[PDB]
Design a protein around this ligand. Sequence first.
Ligand code: MG
Ligand code: MG
Ligand code: MG
Ligand code: MG
Ligand code: ZN
Lengths: 70, 136, 94, 125, 38
Amino acid sequence: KTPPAAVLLKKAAGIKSGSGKPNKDKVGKISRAQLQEIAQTKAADMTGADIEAMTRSIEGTARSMGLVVE
Amino acid sequence: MLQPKRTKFRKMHKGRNRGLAQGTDVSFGSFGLKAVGRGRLTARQIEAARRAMTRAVKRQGKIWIRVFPDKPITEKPLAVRMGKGKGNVEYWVALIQPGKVLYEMDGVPEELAREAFKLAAAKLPIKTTFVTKTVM
Amino acid sequence: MFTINAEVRKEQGKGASRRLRAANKFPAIIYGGKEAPLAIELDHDKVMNMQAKAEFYSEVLTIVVDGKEIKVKAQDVQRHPYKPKLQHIDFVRA
Amino acid sequence: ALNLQDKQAIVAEVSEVAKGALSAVVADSRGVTVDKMTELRKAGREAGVYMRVVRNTLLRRAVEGTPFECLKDAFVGPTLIAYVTEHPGAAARLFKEFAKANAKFEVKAAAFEGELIPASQIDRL
Amino acid sequence: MKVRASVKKLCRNCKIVKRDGVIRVICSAEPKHKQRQG
RNA sequence: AGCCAGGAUGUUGGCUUAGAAGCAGCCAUCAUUUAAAGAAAGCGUAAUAGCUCACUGGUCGAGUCGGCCUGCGCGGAAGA
Ligand SMILES: [Mg+2]
Ligand SMILES: [Mg+2]
Ligand SMILES: [Mg+2]
Ligand SMILES: [Mg+2]
Ligand SMILES: [Zn+2]
């Protein structure tokens, strides 16, 4: 398959590991362009009918590990 | 363990507990534990109840105790005849009439308070009920 | 808009009132304004269900006595000490 | 659970799509993963096909509005409806290749011309 | 079989049933959970 | 109420750990396809797998759910 949403968000925010306390500790930032590229690879792997849908599932995977969208 | 810091008098008359309560209403928090029965709360009992409901809320919200053990109770010790003066003061009580609000609580959801007051009620000698604050 | 039906009281005092409450009605009184204070009785359960809502205390109600309507506010309510019941109610003419 | 108004809105929607669609194929949806269903919704958004799984009691209220009153008897068993709004057919070709490839469910009975078309004869459509 | 004056449901599996003037608790899962009022 | 079926994607969410994959713990608990499916209510594995629930479609076809105030009962209740 395509590499996990978590791995692509880890190499997008420039980090190694995500946050130990997600949404409390913010461990990095990713622009909406990175969200859309990552959710295009994940689009090749997703269930979404739209770009916004898959970019939203990658938004969720971005909030669950503590990485902000900037 | 609650007890009057000082008093005008050391010993007291037994008395009688009659009538209804004053302060049948919740004047502080949202919820309260009101006593439907009749009788005495020793200081110890108030302590234990308070502890139970403090454990149950995990030291969140706020708790009031609207009763206080201001009346001293005496006991002759073992192997003592009658007379030769009034016995010594062992402990203190609060006199409770039907309708009195013993504890009050807020800063917590309803359910948790119900649970807590149940737990505390378990430690008290008199029948109790759960009540809520009303407008007017 | 709450509506309360009531009959005037043919008797008064302690006895009248305890019999009243054991019959599942309860006394009340309407005063204020130019007129004379009007002593009434109410059906317990109706009022007991109505006063459960905040509006009851903040709002103008209508009491139907002998077909005649009177607008009132709830002023002061006496509750039974340990039970979920009402002893008695003051309504001031609005 | 659903409010009565939610169900009124949904009956109005299935009736509104029922008034604009040429051919309607009713098919059992059972025993299928939601990835095969994401693929049938993609192949269904491809052909102009409108796919839904609704309550059958609701489906007889959206059907009662003409000329679908024949399909009331195909609403016994779980019902997945395909409305082709633009072009007729093409749901009838996809549902059979889906039922054959998957080897799941049923594909019970269709409707066209104001008529019911039985499970075997939808090969017409 | 715990014999006590207070009998309760310790889970969803537990079922309270009265046999012959006695309140009992029967659990399909945990025979440890079996109680009798008395 | 029973019975039939689904209970899906990202994903093995991040942190931790030899492993932690809903199911030791800590944090978040978003979003997608949906009729519906908790970053999972319990069992289960070395970790998975696997059993099952929340939830929904079907069948069935008419009453059902839980509080309020009470009346009378049951247990609690063993001695020469
Ligand atoms: Mg006296
Ligand atoms: Mg008298
Ligand atoms: Mg026997
Ligand atoms: Mg059912
Ligand atoms: Zn059990």
